[PDB]
Design a protein around this ligand. Sequence first.
Ligand SMILES: [Mg+2]
Ligand SMILES: [Mg+2]
Ligand SMILES: [Mg+2]
Ligand SMILES: [Mg+2]
Ligand SMILES: [Mg+2]
Lengths: 143, 85, 199, 129, 76
Amino acid sequence: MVRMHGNGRGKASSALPYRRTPPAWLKIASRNVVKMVCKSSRKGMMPSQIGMELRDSMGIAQVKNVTGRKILRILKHNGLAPEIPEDLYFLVKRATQMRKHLERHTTDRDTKYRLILVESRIHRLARYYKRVKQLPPTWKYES
Amino acid sequence: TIGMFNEEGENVDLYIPRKCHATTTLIEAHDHAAVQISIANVGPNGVINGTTTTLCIAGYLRSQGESDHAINHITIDRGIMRIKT
Amino acid sequence: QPHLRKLRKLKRGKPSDLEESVAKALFELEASHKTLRQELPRFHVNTVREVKVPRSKKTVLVVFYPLRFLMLVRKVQRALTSELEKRHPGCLVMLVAQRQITKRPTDVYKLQKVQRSKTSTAVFENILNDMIYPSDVVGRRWRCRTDGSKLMKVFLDARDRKRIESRLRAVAYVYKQLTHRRVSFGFMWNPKLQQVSTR
Amino acid sequence: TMMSVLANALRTIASAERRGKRQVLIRPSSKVVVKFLQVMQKHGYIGEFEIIDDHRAGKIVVNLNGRLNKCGAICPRFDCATTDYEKWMKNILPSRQFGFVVLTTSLGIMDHEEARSRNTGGKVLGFFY
Amino acid sequence: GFFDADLSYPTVRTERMKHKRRRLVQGPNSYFMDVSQVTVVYSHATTSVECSKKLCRPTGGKALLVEGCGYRRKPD
RNA sequence: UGCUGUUGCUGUUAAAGGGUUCGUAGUUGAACUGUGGGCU
RNA sequence: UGCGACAAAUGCUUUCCCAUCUCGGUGUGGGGUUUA
Ligand SMILES: [Mg+2]
Ligand SMILES: [Mg+2]
Ligand SMILES: [Mg+2]
Ligand SMILES: [Mg+2]
Ligand SMILES: [Mg+2]
């Protein structure tokens, strides 16, 4: 979004605290936190969205600091991880919508240029996931 | 103690240039902007006792305009100048 | 006698004079205290060791327990610590979990398989957290002097200066007896902006 | 991107000394960088320094006396046998009376004068004088 | 002036003005509040928070609290 | 002859940065598992 | 199959839903800790 494929140089991001201990006023047991994570997944939420629900309305700043494990690790233990990784899923969805737009507007050359960048990003990402065996070999992206 | 000595024990240096108190650089023979300032020591009654303290400031520090700032720090370290109120 | 059940099965034979005294206190508390009565039944200690801090009056009692009960002890550490002090006047008690360390390998392939929680860096950090548990570390610095020495300083929150100030001399000495490393302490008001407090 | 942490740190120190600053901040830190500073500290070229922990690659604040003229890294880290010491002294040092070349050897990190006494070679890291 | 600035112990005036990732040690900017049933609300919430009605409105920065319910900042 | 430049050249105007991006071989690539201790 | 003894880096005197009904110790007369 910033550096690869473009000239952006933005710095906006979050900064985790030095003190990794949950506050005293938080009185939720670790078992119940794990239950809420798995419940939201069956409802259809992605790991990024799950962590924001707990942050916004439950007082849980970091799931790892309460339970000892990350959100995606919890889903893998319960057999709830997505078939393909989340960031690869969103990039494929974006490219599909670009291609559907382009089949009517054949002269939108700016969109055609952006489609080249997104598909290069997909192929780089797929190569990494195949090396660490998060994707099957011979997985291929089809335009 | 300061300078270059041969193995015979004699000092073989022409002279020892001044070393600045603020910049710790050597002051060369053709600086012409380096200065020395003498501040009198005043006795408890409120008059001078006949002794002064001397400071040296390299020329380039006076070109950047930082010579005034260096003087402030030095005087405090010597107890000549107070701070706060 | 029932109170010996609070010890490890190895030491139930010939307990030392310090071991059974703690055992009696733990057994008595397990049936009297309101909050300890549902955690204590599953708990038992390994051994108790006595340390004499030089240039001081109070002595330090160190209690070792298996790492299984880490979460059990952390839940009731405040009440358990204060309760034991009353039974043993003129002494200070610290609860330390017994951990093992795997020595650092020389071969690259072996180094990749080390369990990170068994490294000396991780173990010594957790031992320090045990001795000050109600408080936590808010900063840490290393001071490298010109003579070549390196001194480590740990900063605590100033909000709980009153509670833990008296114990810092004992904690520093005991930490050296268990790890053979030097530590020093300081306080920070507003640790977010790294502001240290002088008195 | 940043390829060498050691090269980045030494350039920061030399620049601060040239401008006459009293302290300088260094980031990111590394265990190789700390060893290099201790060698300079032992011979009296820098003052006291301090390491700050932040659960990441830390930071270092070092106090400078006015004695340092220049420090720098050598890239790539060439190999140096015991017979090559005179060659490197002749090329990157101001004189044969002062200055040091820092090496990494199987005995640790040390200056070239100590390495010669121990009769060991290694790889060149940098220099200072 | 007249005060020497130590890099490792900056003054509160200087350090307070810095960007959160430009401090000597980086840290968060947000916090938690409780409102009044009683619920905990993140200071920079972007999703919808329900009691029975919505309690905050998302914004480019801090969330906007509705009028007619008391709030209090939680410690730590 | 530092006018072939690894040591060790030049590229705003003297000769010389490709019209702009994507990209495979290739070259290059962030931190971390480590202060031994006691005696005269 | 039974038996004796000891560990365990993570609590089976577990979890889960199925239901059915003021004193003492501590630091300087006051402070802070557990408890009442
Ligand atoms: Mg020649
Ligand atoms: Mg030429
Ligand atoms: Mg031209
Ligand atoms: Mg151009
Ligand atoms: Mg590296």
